[PDB]
Paper text:
Rspo (R-spondin, also roof plate-specific spondin) proteins are evolutionarily conserved from fish to humans and have well-documented roles in a broad range of developmental and physiological processes resulting from enhancement of canonical and non-canonical Wnt signalling. Direct extracellular interaction with Rspo proteins inhibits ZNRF3/RNF43 activity. Here we report a molecular level analysis of the ZNRF3/RNF43 ectodomain structure and its interactions with Rspo proteins.
All but two of these crystal structures reveal an extensive interface (average interface area 992±109 Å2) formed between two ZNRF3ecto polypeptide chains. The interaction is twofold symmetric; strands β3 and β7 of the ‘subunits’ abut face-to-face at the core of the dimer. Formation of the observed crystallographic ZNRF3 dimer in solution is further supported by the observation of almost quantitative spontaneous crosslinking of the S90C variant of mZNRF3ecto that introduces a cysteine close to the dimer symmetry axis. Ligand binding leads to a structuring of the acidic region of the β3–β4 loop. This same region of the β3–β4 loop also interacts with the β1–β2 hairpin in the opposing subunit of the ZNRF3ecto dimer. This stabilizing effect provides an explanation for our results showing that Rspo2Fu1–Fu2 bound weaker to monomerized mZNRF3ecto E92N, E94T but stronger to predimerized mZNRF3ecto S90C than to the wt mZNRF3ecto. Consistent with these co-immunoprecipitation data, Rspo2Fu1–Fu2 simultaneously bound to ZNRF3 and LGR5 in SPR binding assays with the monomerized ZNRF3ecto binding weaker and the dimerized S90C variant binding stronger to a preformed LGR5ecto–RspoFu1–Fu2 complex.
Author numbering:
A (entry chain A), B (entry chain A): 54 to 104, 112 to 204
The structure:
Amino acid sequence: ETAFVEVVLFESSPSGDYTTHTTGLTGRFSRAGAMLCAEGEIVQMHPLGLCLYEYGWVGVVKLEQPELDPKPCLTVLGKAKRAVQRGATAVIFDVSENPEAIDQLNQGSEDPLKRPVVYVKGADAIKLMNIVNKQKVARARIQH
Amino acid sequence: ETAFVEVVLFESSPSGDYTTHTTGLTGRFSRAGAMLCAEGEIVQMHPLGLCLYEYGWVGVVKLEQPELDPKPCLTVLGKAKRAVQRGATAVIFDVSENPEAIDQLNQGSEDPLKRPVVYVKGADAIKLMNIVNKQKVARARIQH
């Protein structure tokens, strides 16, 4: 159930060789989805944004104040299927502001997503968001 | 040591939802590299081609006749580090025409690659090459 998440920054040279910088951090696979491998360019999405990107992105979604979106178009899990329908290979939720979403995401689900749904919080959520907020271009790799 | 490889074709709709088609096939992780997760757009590369692509591609390389390239610029493994230096997250070798490369690739290597090096052959190699030869655009996901 523990997800290892690596976030990669990269730059190429005149030589055409890449320079990379990697950050590791920890989250949990939701029972909502598959406990599998995923890797792709990060696309930061507002949660309301899930009420076009090239196939295979990893959505990063910071859940809002539950009393900021008291009447949500879809449930957290529905949002994640919506993301996958639109080409996401993985969804990471930052559930810091909305910890209650954990209970909904570790409900087992008959008919669960075929792709991973990871949640982070705490320090790991901060390190993730520090990068995705800074760099326009990053790559996430999810495992374990 | 067994690698599960999925090759994904995809098409989007006017709605912005993707239609996908997936093929599974089997290979082996080389000891040359890490027995880890990898996922990315496939880039078919001629082996001589490894004597610019966006970070995170999966190289697919059909090894040539050993008596076609009797004096190779680099070893099979060197070619794979070269691929990774140029942004590959994974290398798949089709070692059908050159089975001898297996012995070189299952040498343990102090200082092994940090990314996976998979080899396929037989029927699995055929299914892989059938797709990468047909579709300009595919995505590989490697695991297990």
